[PDB]
Symmetry: C3
Subunit: 155 residues, 3 copies
């Protein structure tokens, strides 16, 4: 069994909605990013690649490579996972922690878990997502951006 850790942040910018964990969440402002800026799935991906010792998302899919411009983060997630499985690993479980003052992630989590468990090919039971605010403190508390952390256990 191997453990992995990921972390990511994206700044708000433009018009909503935002895409977090695959779910299109309505919000006043949107997220600035090369990809779809899915903070939750980037953080999750790095955690998996991390536990597989494959580096990180920016190693496999370059921030600068133009093909990833607007790229569906679930696409990157599924590839990183394909590569991880090929290296001989199987999913233990993952846990995601979305750090955002707003929007309200709560109602979108079940669906977030459906997408992720799909992409990973596991039961939703091996996938957990939660959220927290930083009580108006920080760039997150000020609504400047969203951050997200994640851990994964591979077998």
């Amino acid at each position: 069994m191997r453990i992995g850790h990921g972390f990511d942040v994206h700044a708000f910018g433009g018009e909503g909605p935002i895409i977090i964990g695959g779910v299109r969440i309505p919000y006043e402002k949107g997220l600035l990013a090369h990809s779809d800026g899915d903070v939750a799935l980037h953080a999750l991906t790095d955690a998996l690649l991390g536990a597989a010792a494959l580096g990180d998302i920016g190693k496999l899919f370059p921030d600068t490579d133009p093909a990833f411009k607007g790229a569906d983060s679930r696409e990157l997630l599924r590839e990183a996972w394909r590569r991880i499985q090929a290296k001989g690993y199987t999913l233990g479980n993952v846990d995601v922690t979305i750090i955002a003052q707003a929007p309200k992630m709560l109602p979108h989590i079940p669906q977030m878990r459906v997408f992720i468990a799909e992409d990973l090919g596991c039961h939703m039971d091996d996938v957990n997502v939660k959220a927290t605010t930083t009580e108006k403190l920080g760039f997150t508390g000020r609504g400047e951006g969203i951050a997200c952390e994640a851990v994964a256990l591979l077998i």
Copy 2:
């Protein structure tokens, strides 16, 4: 074995003391919160619920539900743990990282570990707590609030 991750932050406000990890730590200012604002135990709780795939603290015990107003975070911890055990899990071990510029958590950690190991019904050996400052950087470095991270391994 399952892994979990939690994270929490609370802003300073009012008169001291603060309650972290169950310990009443004396400090100039106190912590603003619905509950007792025990950042360390909230972070710990989410990590456990996270590894159990039960969501998070705000799911089980609503921030808005008035009964949790002033609620002893060890109470929430023990319940979340009861529910976790019922789902068939047993504690592997937990590790907490308190991120605060001040107060000095160090002298209070042994006692923090006694409370937590009690609430979890394990040996202190399966419970670790540590602290760190952010070197005067950030909302924590500026003494605006305390943050805390935690991980847990369930069996």
Copy 3:
């Protein structure tokens, strides 16, 4: 198997280069610290000590003790590891996440992994390091300092 979590931050200050993960990385400004301010290895160390239930780096090697002034963080890492092994543990694997807007950690990671795997006496395969920016947000985004997180699994 035991899990551990570490976190650390150091403010920029003075002239470069910086030392991260053992690697001397060239940068305009340098890092302020008692030790060599190796954020990555401090974070890694706490994760290992954390999983071993030995506390944290500041417990074993006091910030105030003058001998650690300028201390090679790999030295502290190796000791904490010696002590950890003595307590009967063996390395499962570690994963580090350097949170910095700049400098570019990417090219230095292979070498970072060589040093760490050496100090831990494992194969590089049990050691992963990755990096991320906070998209110009926060003290990190503002180039005020570097932060780093890490997780470890002991056996």
